[PDB]
Coordinates of C-alpha atoms and ligand atoms in Angstrom, one line a residue:
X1 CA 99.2 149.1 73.3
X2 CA 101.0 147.1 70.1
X3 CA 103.5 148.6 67.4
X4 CA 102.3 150.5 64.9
X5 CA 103.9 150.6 61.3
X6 CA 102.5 153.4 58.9
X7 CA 103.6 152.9 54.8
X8 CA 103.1 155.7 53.3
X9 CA 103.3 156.4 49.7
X10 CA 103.8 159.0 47.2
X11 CA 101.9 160.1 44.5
X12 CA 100.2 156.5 44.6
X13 CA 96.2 156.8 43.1
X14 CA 93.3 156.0 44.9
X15 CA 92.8 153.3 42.0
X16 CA 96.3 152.2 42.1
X17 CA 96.1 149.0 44.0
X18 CA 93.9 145.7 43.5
X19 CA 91.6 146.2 46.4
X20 CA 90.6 149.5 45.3
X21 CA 90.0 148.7 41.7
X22 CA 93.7 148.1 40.2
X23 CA 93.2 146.0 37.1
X24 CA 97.3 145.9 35.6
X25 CA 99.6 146.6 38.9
X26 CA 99.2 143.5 41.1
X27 CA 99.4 144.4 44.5
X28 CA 98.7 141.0 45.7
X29 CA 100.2 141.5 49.4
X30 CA 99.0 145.1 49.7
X31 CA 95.5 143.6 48.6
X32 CA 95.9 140.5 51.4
X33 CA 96.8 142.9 54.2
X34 CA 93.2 144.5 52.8
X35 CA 91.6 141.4 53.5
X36 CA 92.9 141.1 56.6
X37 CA 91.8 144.2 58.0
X38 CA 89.5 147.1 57.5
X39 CA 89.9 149.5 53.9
X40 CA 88.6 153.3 54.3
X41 CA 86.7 154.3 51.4
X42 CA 86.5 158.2 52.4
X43 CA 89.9 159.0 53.5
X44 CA 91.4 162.3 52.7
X45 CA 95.1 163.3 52.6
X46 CA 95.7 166.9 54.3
X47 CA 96.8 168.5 50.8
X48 CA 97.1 167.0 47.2
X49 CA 101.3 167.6 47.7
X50 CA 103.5 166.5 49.2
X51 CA 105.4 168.2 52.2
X52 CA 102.3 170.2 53.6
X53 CA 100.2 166.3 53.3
X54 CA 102.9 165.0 55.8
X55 CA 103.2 168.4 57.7
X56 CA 99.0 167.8 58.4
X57 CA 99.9 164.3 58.9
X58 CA 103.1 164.1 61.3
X59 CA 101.3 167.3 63.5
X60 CA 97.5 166.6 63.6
X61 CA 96.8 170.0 62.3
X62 CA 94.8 170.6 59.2
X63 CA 96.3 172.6 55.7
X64 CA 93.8 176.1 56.9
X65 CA 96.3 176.0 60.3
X66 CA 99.4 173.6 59.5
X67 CA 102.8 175.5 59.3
X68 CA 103.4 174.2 55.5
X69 CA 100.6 174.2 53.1
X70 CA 102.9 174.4 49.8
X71 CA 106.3 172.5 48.3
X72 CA 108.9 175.8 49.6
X73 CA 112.7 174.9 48.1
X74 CA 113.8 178.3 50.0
X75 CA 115.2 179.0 46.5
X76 CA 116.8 182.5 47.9
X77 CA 119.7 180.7 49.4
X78 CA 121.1 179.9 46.3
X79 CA 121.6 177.2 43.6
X80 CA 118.6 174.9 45.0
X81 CA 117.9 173.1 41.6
X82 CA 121.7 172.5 41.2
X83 CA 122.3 169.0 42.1
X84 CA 126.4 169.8 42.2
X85 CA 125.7 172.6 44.0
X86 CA 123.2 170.6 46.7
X87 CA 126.1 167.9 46.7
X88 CA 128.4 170.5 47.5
X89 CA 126.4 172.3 49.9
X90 CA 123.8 170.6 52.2
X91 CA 122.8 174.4 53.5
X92 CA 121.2 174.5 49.8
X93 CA 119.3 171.0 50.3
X94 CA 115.5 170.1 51.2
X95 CA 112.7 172.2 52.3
X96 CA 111.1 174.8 54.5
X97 CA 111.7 173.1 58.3
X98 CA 108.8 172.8 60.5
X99 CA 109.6 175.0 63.8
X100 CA 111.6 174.2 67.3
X101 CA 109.8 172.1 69.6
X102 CA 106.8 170.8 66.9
X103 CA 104.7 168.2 68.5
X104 CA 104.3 165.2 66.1
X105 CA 103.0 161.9 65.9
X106 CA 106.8 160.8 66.1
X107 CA 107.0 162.7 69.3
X108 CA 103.8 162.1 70.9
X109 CA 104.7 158.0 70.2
X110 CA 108.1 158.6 72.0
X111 CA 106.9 160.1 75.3
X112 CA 104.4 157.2 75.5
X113 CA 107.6 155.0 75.2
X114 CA 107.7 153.9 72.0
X115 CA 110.8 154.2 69.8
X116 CA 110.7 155.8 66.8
X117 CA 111.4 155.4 63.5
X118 CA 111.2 157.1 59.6
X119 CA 112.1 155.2 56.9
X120 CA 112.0 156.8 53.3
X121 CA 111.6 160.0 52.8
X122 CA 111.8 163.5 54.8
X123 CA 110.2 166.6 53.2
X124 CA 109.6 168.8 56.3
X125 CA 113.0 170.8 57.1
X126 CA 116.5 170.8 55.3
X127 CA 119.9 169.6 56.7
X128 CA 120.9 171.3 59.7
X129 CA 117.4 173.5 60.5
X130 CA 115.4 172.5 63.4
X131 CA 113.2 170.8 61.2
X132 CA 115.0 167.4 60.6
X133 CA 113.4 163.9 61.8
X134 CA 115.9 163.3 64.9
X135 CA 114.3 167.3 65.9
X136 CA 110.8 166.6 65.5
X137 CA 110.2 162.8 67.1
X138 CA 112.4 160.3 65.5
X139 CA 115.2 158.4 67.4
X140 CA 116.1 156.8 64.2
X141 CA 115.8 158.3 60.5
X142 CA 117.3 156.8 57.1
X143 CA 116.7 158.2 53.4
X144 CA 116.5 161.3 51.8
X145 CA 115.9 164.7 53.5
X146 CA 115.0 166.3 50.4
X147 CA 112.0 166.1 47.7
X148 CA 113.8 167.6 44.9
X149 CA 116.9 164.8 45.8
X150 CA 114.3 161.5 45.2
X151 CA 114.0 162.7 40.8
X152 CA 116.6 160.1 40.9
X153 CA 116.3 156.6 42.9
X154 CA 120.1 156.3 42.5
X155 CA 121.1 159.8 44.6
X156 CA 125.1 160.2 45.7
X157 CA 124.1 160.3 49.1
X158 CA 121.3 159.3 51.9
X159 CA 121.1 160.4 55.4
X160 CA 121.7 158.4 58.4
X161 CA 119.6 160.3 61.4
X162 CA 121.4 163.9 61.1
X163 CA 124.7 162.1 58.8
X164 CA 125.1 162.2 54.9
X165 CA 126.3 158.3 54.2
X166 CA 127.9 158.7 50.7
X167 CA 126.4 156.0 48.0
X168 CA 128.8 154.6 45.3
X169 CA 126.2 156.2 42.5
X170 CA 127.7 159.3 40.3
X171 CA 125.6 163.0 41.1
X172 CA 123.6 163.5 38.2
X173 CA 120.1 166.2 37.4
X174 CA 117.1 163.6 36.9
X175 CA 116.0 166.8 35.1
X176 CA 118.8 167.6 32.5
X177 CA 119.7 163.9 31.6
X178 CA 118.5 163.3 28.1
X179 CA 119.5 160.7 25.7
X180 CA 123.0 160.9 24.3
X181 CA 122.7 162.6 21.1
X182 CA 121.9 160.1 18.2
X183 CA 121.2 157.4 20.8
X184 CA 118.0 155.3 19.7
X185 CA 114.9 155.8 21.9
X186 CA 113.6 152.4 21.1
X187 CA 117.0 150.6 21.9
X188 CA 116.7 149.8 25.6
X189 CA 120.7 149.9 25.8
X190 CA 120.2 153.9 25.3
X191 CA 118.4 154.0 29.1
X192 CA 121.2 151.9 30.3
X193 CA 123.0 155.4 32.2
X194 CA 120.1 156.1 34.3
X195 CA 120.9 152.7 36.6
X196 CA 123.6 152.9 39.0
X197 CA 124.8 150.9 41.7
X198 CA 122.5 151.7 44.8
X199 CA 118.5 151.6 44.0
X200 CA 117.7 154.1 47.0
X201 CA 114.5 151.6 47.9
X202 CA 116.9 148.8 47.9
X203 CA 118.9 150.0 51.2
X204 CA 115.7 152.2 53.2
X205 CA 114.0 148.6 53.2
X206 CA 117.3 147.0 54.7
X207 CA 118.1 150.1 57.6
X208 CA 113.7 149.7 58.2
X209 CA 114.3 146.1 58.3
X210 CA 117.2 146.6 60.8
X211 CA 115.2 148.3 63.1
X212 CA 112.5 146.2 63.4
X213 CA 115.3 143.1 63.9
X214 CA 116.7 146.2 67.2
X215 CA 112.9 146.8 68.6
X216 CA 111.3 143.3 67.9
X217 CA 111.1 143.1 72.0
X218 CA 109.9 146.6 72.5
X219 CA 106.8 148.9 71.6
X220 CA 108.3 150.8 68.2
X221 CA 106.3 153.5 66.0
X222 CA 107.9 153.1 62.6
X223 CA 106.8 155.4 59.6
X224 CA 108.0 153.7 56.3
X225 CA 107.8 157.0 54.2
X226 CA 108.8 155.8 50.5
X227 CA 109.0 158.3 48.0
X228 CA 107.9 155.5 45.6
X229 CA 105.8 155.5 43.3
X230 CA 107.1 159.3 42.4
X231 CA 109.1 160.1 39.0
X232 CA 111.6 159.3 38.1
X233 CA 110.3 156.1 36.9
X234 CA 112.9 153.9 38.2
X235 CA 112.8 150.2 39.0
X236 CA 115.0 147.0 39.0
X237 CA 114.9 145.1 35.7
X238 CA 113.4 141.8 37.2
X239 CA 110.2 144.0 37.6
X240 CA 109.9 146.0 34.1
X241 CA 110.5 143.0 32.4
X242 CA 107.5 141.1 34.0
X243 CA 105.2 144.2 33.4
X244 CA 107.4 144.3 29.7
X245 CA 105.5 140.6 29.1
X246 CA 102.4 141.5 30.3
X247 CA 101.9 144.9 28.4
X248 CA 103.9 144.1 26.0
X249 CA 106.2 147.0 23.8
X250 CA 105.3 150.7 24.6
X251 CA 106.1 154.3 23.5
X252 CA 109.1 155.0 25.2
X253 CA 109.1 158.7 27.3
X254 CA 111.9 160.8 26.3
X255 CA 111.6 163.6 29.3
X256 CA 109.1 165.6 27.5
X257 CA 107.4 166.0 31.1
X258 CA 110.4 166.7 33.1
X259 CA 112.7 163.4 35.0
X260 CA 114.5 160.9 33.7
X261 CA 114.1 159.0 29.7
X262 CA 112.3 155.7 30.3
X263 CA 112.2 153.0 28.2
X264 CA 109.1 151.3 29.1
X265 CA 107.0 154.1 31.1
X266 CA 103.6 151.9 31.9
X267 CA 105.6 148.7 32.9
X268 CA 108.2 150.8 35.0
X269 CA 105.3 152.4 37.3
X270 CA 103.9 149.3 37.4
X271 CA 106.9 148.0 38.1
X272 CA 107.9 150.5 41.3
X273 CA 104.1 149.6 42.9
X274 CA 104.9 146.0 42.9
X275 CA 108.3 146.0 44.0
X276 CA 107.3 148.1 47.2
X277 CA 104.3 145.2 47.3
X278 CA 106.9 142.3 47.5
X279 CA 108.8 144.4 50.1
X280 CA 105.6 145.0 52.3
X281 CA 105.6 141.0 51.9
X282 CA 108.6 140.5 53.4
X283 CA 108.0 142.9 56.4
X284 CA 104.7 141.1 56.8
X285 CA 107.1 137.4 57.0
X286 CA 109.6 138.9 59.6
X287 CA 106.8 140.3 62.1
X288 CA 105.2 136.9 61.8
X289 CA 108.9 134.9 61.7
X290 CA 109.3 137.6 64.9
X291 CA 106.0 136.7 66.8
X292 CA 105.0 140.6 66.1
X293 CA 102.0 140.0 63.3
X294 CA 98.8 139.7 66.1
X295 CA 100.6 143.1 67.9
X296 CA 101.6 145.3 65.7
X297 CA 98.7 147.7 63.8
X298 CA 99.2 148.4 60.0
X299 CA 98.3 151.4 57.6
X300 CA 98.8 151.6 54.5
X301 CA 97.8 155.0 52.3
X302 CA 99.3 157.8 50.0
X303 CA 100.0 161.3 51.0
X304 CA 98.3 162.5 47.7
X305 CA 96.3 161.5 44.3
X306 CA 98.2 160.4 41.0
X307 CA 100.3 162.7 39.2
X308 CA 100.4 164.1 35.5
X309 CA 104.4 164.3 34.4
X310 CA 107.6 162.3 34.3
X311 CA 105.9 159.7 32.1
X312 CA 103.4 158.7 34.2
X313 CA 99.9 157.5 32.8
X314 CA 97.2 158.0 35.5
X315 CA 94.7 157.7 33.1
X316 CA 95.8 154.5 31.4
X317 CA 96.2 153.2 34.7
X318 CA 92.7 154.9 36.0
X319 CA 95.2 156.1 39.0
X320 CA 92.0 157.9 40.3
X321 CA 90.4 154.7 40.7
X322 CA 86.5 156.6 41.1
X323 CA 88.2 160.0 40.0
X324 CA 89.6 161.1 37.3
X325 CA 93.4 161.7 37.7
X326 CA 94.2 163.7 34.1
X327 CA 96.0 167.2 35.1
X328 CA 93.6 169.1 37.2
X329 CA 92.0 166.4 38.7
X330 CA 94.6 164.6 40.7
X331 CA 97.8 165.9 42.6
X332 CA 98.1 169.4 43.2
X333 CA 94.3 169.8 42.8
X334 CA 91.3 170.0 45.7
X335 CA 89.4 167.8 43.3
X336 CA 88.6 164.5 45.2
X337 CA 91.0 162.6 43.1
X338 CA 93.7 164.5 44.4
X339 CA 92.8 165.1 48.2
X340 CA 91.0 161.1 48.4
X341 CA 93.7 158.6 49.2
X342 CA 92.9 154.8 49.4
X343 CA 93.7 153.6 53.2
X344 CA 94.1 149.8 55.0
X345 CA 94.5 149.5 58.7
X346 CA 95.2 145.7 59.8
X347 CA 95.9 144.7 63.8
X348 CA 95.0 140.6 63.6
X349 CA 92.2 139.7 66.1
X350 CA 91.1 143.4 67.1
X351 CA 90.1 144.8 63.7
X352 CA 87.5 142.2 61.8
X353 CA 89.1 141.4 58.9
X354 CA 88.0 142.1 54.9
X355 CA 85.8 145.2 56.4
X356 CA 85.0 148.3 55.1
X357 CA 84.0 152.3 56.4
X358 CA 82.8 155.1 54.4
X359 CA 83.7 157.0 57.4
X360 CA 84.9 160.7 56.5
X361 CA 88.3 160.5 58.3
X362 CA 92.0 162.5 57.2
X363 CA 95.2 163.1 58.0
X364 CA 94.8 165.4 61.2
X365 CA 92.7 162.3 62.6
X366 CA 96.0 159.8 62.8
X367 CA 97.5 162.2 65.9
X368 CA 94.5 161.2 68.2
X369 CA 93.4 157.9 66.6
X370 CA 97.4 157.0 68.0
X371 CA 97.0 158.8 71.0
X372 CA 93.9 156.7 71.8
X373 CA 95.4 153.8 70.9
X374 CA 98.4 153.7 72.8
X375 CA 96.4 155.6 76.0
X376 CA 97.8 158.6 76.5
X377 CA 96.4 162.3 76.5
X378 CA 96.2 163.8 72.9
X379 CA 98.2 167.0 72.1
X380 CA 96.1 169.9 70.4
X381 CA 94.7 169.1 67.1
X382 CA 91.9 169.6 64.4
X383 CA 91.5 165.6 64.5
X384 CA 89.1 163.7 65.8
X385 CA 89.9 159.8 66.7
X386 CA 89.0 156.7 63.9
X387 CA 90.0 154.3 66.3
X388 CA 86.4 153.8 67.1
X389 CA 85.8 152.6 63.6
X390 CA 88.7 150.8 63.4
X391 CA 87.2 148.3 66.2
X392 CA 83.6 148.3 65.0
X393 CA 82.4 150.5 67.6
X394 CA 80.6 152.5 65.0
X395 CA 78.4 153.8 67.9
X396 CA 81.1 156.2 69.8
X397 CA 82.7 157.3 66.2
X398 CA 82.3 161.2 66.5
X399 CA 81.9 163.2 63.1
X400 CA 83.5 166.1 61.7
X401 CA 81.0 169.2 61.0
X402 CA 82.9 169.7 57.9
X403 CA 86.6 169.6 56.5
X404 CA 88.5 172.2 54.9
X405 CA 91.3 171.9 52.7
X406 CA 93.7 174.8 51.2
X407 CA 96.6 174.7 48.7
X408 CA 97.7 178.4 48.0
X409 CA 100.7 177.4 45.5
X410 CA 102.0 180.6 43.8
X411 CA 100.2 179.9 39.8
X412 CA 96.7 178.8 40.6
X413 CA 95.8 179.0 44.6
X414 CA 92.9 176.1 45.9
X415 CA 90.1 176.1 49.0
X416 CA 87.8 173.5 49.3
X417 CA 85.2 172.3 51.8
X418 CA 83.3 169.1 52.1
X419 CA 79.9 169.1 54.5
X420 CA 78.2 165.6 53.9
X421 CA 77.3 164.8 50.2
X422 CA 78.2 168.6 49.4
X423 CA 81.7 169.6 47.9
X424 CA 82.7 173.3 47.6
X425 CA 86.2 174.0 45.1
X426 CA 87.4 177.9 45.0
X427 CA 90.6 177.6 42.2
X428 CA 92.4 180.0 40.6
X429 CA 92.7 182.1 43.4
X430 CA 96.1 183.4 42.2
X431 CA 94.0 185.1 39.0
X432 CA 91.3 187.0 41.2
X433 CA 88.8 183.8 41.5
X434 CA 86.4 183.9 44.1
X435 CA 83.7 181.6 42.5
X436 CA 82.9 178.6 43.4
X437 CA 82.1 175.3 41.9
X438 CA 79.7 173.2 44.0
X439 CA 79.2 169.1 43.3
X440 CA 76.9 167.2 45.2
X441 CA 79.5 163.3 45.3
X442 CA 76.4 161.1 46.6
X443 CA 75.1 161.9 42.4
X444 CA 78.2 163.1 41.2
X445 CA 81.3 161.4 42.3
X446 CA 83.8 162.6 39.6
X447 CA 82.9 166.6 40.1
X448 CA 81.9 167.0 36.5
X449 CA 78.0 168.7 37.1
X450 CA 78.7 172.2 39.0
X451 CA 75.4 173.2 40.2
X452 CA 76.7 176.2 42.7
X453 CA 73.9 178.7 41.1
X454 CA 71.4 175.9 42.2
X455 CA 72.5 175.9 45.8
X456 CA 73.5 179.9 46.7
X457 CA 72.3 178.4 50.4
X458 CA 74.8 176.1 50.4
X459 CA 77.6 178.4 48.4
X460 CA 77.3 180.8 50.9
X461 CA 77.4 178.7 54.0
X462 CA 80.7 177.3 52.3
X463 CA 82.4 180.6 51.9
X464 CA 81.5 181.9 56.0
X465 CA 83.3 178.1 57.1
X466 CA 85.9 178.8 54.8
X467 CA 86.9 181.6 56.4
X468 CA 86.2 180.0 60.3
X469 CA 88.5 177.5 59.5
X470 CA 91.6 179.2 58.4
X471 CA 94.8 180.8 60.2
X472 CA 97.4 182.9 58.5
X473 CA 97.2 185.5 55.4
X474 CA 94.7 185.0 53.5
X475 CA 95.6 184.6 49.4
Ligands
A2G501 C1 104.4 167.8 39.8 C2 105.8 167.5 40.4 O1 106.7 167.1 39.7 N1 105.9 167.8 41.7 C3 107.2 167.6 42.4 C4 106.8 167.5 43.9 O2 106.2 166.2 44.1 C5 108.1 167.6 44.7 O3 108.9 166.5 44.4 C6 108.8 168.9 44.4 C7 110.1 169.0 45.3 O4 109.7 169.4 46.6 O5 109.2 168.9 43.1 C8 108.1 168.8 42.2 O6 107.3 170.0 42.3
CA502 CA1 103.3 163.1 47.0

């Protein structure tokens, strides 16, 4: 049974890397590990946002019966969006905790005897609840607890497992730092502020690289959660510059769309994608330098599609890749560029290399794909094992019926279901929708042609397995 490093990403497109169709971010090392192993072509995140994606993920339970299917700051204990006030008060910090006694992928690992590891970013319980990483499967944990506290990639603190390690960078509001007044936009001098000492990605790559150094003679399960490439669009100079030749000069983004001013918007997010690339490079070097590379099993995915604010440009970039990624169509949205992340698994000599599966497979699945692979009973779950396909043993790979996703944010509310070819989207739940749009995505990829008065069969099948698949209130 061999280590297992997952790199998960954060509002990184289906289309944002070479091997999946990237034609301006190179991703030259992300795009070698793809031709070292297998790429999954129908992968699905367990929700197009953030916390409840890793909350499907880290417990093998799908959005219809996960514990968080929404972003919740727990705004009623006080000054949340404050960053003094966060600083001041931790109690105020990070999001709704997954309960006492949760089993996760993190925990599942460690009573097989692995030791565990989360590198990045948190998202599934706040400072001192019962939901932090060292309480739900992690030995070892290093990064930011909190969603709203990675705006800014130069925060005043991190955490070390349950400990605040203070940073030498001043507290500021990623969301109320504009331009000094009468400051050129055009002048890159006038963006100077927003870099600080300590580039958060800088030191979670040094504490991941530490404990791979620690575990390098013992089975380790290591999730390398960045929060890149989410706003603020932050990245070291060396990078901007090279995507600053290549693009040349650009509209500058002046926080119209919430987070920080940047200069050079299109170069920066390229910029963040291919400094994360150079660092997968050198984690690639160490496990080989380390003897690790032929035993230890790589994925690589996001935890949802591209995003539509903080002066990002999914569609200059075609983030969706297939899909389009414009607001509506990527993150926070059931359509398939929001819910349909790309996905590499590499583990030299055991998975053929340069491979592909159109294999419907999601976040649920990765609890008993792992339990599989390292040969131990799986926990309850709404997953069914990809390991199967993995090794080219396409013959035992058992099939979901159907999948069924729901995102019931407070504005606009989402359900979807896809059966084979067929795709079912109920939205605007919130305003008294119950319609739904229908797309057949063997003739209609990018959901544009709804043909649900065409199919009241199928429409109707949708809506019963909607509700068969679903705990809770309803919305
Ligand atoms: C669309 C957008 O900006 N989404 C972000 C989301 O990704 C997460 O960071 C959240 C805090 O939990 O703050 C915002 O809602
Ligand atoms: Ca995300």
């Amino acid at each position: 049974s061999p280590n297992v490093i997952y790199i998960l990403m954060d509002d990184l497109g289906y289309g944002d890397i070479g091997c999946f169709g990237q034609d301006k971010i190179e991703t030259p090392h992300i795009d070698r590990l793809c031709s070292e192993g297998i790429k999954l072509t129908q992968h699905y995140s367990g929700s197009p946002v953030s916390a409840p994606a890793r909350c499907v993920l880290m417990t093998g339970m799908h959005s219809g019966h996960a514990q968080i299917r929404f972003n919740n700051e727990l705004a009623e204990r006080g000054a949340v969006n404050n960053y003094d006030s966060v600083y001041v008060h931790k109690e105020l910090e990070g999001q709704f905790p997954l309960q006492a006694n949760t089993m996760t992928i993190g925990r599942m690992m460690q009573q097989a005897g692995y030791t565990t590891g989360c590198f990045g970013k948190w998202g599934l319980g706040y400072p001192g609840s019962e939901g932090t990483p060292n309480k739900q499967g992690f030995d070892r944990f290093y990064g930011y607890n909190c969603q709203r506290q990675s705006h800014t990639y130069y925060p005043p603190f991190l955490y070390n497992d349950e400990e605040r390690v203070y940073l030498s960078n001043k507290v500021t509001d990623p969301h109320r730092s504009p331009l000094d007044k009468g400051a050129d936009p055009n002048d890159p001098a006038s963006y100077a502020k927003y870099t600080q000492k300590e580039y958060a990605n800088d030191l979670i790559f040094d504490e991941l690289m530490g404990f791979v150094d620690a575990n390098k003679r013992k089975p380790f399960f290591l999730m390398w959660t960045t929060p890149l490439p989410h706003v603020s669009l932050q990245a070291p100079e060396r990078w901007v510059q090279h995507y600053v030749k290549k693009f040349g000069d650009e509209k500058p983004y002046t926080g119209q769309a919430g987070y920080l001013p940047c200069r050079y918007p299109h170069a920066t997010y390229a910029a963040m994608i291919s400094y994360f690339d150079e660092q997968i490079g050198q984690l690639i070097e160490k496990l080989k330098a380390e003897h690790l590379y032929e035993n230890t099993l790589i994925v690589f995915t996001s935890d949802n599609g591209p995003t539509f604010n903080g002066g990002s440009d999914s569609p200059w970039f075609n983030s969706g890749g297939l899909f389009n990624s414009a607001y509506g169509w990527g993150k926070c949205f059931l359509h398939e560029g929001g819910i349909r992340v790309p996905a590499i698994i590499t583990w030299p000599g055991k998975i053929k290399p340069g491979t592909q599966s159109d294999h419907i497979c999601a976040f649920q699945d990765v609890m008993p794909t792992l339990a599989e692979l390292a040969g131990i009973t799986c926990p309850p779950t709404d997953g069914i094992s990809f390991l199967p396909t993995l090794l080219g043993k396409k013959g035992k790979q058992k099939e979901h019926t159907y999948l069924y996703w729901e995102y019931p944010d407070p504005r606009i509310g989402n359900k979807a279901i896809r059966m084979g070819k067929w795709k079912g989207i109920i939205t605007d739940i919130r305003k008294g929708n119950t319609q739904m749009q229908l797309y057949n995505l063997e003739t209609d990829i990018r959901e544009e042609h709804d043909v649900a008065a065409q199919h009241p069969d199928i429409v109707k099948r949708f809506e019963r397995l909607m509700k068969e698949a679903r705990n809770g209130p309803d919305f």
